[PDB]
Subunit: 317 residues, 3 copies
């Protein structure tokens, strides 16, 4: 039947028009979608940058340059993400060499401690160094609640602080601010350069200090504490018993305050010193001068007495 054939052909013609219609809309249907605001978003434009422009501050592909405070627009979302990943995010940038790390294949930081933070090239917090902080190239922290900041700073004791270039703090509850200093003493602190602090409860504000005593305080370039407890003070042997005990009562109890190093010819005046009042207060030159002046007054009475006696001796004869 012709009419049966014609009807099949009309139907097919209708199916074909409908097919072409479907085909038409597929694309726009697959790539164009509505986000949760009701904005139509094109999936392709979210993944591939349709118009790169380093100056377009609204680009979803934008990166913040690690130096110079400008931006760079990337080609795909993955590129953007990996640039962030290696060159930094805004306000957090590390400019790195191509070295190998001490622990693994990268030169990443390594935050090994629970609640630890590690920042910078080869900045390492050890496993177990909990609540610790490393910030800087080659920093290393092995202690709990410890801090290393700087180039090669190491904070290796518990509650250790190491700020500056290449200080190494092994003492617990200890620290060093400066460069090239080592602190092995516990409860000991150094401010300055090239110090070595082996003793406990020791403080150094100085450079090139290497001789200390526990409990000591060393002040200034090249000073040295070499004395501690039990140094008998200088006393006049012609002194009374009560006066010798008052001196003895002030006998040293612990490491000295050192302001120089007589060994090596290093001596500092102490200036701006108020007259002492009580037994263990320092004495100033004014207080010594009153004594000197009295010595002179005594000497002058003696000279006169000697004069009198000489005359008396002659008068007798």
């Amino acid at each position: 039947k012709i009419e049966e054939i014609l009807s099949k052909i009309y139907h097919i013609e209708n199916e074909i028009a409908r097919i072409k219609k479907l085909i038409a809309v597929i694309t726009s249907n697959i790539t164009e979608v509505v986000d949760g605001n009701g904005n139509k978003v094109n999936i392709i434009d979210q993944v591939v940058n349709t118009k790169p422009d380093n100056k377009n501050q609204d680009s979803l592909f934008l990166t913040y340059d690690k130096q110079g405070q400008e931006t760079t627009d990337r080609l795909t979302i993955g590129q953007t993400v990996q640039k962030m990943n290696t060159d930094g995010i805004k306000f957090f940038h590390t400019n790195a060499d191509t070295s190998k790390g001490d622990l693994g294949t990268t030169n990443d930081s390594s935050a090994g401690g629970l609640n630890s933070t590690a920042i910078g090239v080869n900045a390492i917090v050890a496993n177990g160094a909990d609540s610790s902080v490393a910030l800087g190239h080659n920093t290393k922290v092995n202690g709990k609640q410890s801090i290393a900041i700087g180039s090669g700073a190491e904070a290796l004791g518990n509650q250790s602080i190491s700020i500056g270039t290449g200080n190494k703090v092994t003492g617990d509850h200890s620290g060093a601010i400066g460069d090239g200093t080592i602190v092995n003493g516990a409860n000991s602190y150094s401010v300055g350069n090239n110090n070595q602090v082996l003793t406990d409860d020791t403080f150094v504000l100085g450079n090139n200090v290497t001789k200390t005593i526990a409990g000591s305080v060393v002040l200034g370039n090249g000073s040295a504490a070499t004395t501690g407890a039990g140094e008998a003070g200088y006393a006049l042997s012609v002194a009374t018993n009560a006066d010798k005990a008052a001196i003895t009562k002030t006998t040293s109890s612990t490491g000295a305050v050192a302001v120089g190093d007589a060994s090596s010819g290093i001596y500092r005046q102490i200036t701006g010193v108020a007259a002492g009042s009580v037994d263990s207060d320092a004495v100033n030159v004014a207080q010594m001068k009153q004594i000197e002046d009295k010595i002179e007054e005594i000497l002058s009475k003696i000279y006169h007495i000697e004069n009198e006696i000489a005359r008396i001796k002659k008068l007798i004869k």
Copy 2:
């Protein structure tokens, strides 16, 4: 008409071949696109990792492990992004517990101040603490232009600095480096452990220091400043009027330098001290020895005078 039917069939056959052609290219057309370099990019491969490989340093899906300096390759771009987001980017890693924060549901840092930076687990800069820095687990900064670094460091005054474990600095323009120290004084600084600094313009380089006076400086473990301005120096009552005023001229103006604590039997020698020159310079043992030696020379003239007088008295009779 047969020929009319045949023609419709040929046309349809042509439309069908053309349809299949269109269908063929759709895919490659939808997913394969050209970026701004003219590189063909496959959208799917930008979003889903076609070949995960922890060692493939060019992977767009790569993450930098928070410890150990190795990498991990992720399955999708969103996974990569969220790993960066929680485990860190290269050179910026915090290894966190699963705690709740003090402010909100996460244990994130919180940079509350304008131009502030907050880093680490529960590291908090308060609203209004502008230009401030917190770096470390449980750090808290409430002051403007303030710095807390370490485990539980708090910098609560304006221009306050707190570096180490659990120091708390409330004073303005003040700071503490060490562990367990509190500084409430304004314009006051402590280096050391378990100090308490309540006074202003006070400096401590020491541990276990808790007694201070405004303007004082306390040096060493257990030292204590308990005296300030207006301490009348020790003076010989047999001294002249000019000599008493020279002493009085050097009377203390402010808190002492304390190197010990006579109360508790703590005393330190001061060593390396150069001979004083002017009135408010400290005196050393060498300068006291010259006086002692003169006392002996005086005593020996007196002994001889007494001898003479005794003979004179007998000679008279």
Copy 3:
């Protein structure tokens, strides 16, 4: 031939059914893919957030708020990435103003040195300042292996350390902790506020200190070191030759320890001082009292001698 026409029509009907089948599966085929775990992933859901929910901690679109420790769920992957990029990742947040930077169009940090790390708004490490660290608003570091932390801290010398508000350290191997301090001296350190340290190997633990001598140590608010090497100690002119040389042997070698400033009426007692033993040890009040007491004993013998002599003179007549 009818039968030839019918056969072409049956074939076309079969092609049409097959086409519609292909069309059906395209979508699901293009967008639904298998990742490297064998999980089926929908490409669209990786790029566009199908259900935003600020509380959904598994969202691939989640951001960590820069303050308050809560999260925000974003609409597309690019939004997420750029929020991370500008507002921070978890544990690394800077809350920034809308300023211009000193170097470029943004207010980003700038890590100019190899292996340097720069963090915070307008935190700048210069080109060539290698292995250096800047952390804080307006920090600037120009030296190698240098550290600036705080608001406007500058570390401009090599191995320079500057922590606090607006300190400026130009000296090499030098540093300042505090606020408003300048250190131009090399190998010199200041703890405190508004100090100016022009000299080398100089240490200040104090505020408002501006007069120093190389090698000096200045302790406390307003103290001033104005003397160095070669100060001849106070000596009794009535002293022996050996005693004058012992004093001369302790003559100052370098900058003083200053605890006050006699110029401006500033004087501090030094308290807790143990009796000195050797020549360059400080002397305390106890050691001066033994001398004073002996002066009195001498004066009393002299008074008696004078008495005797007066009687002798009368007895003779």
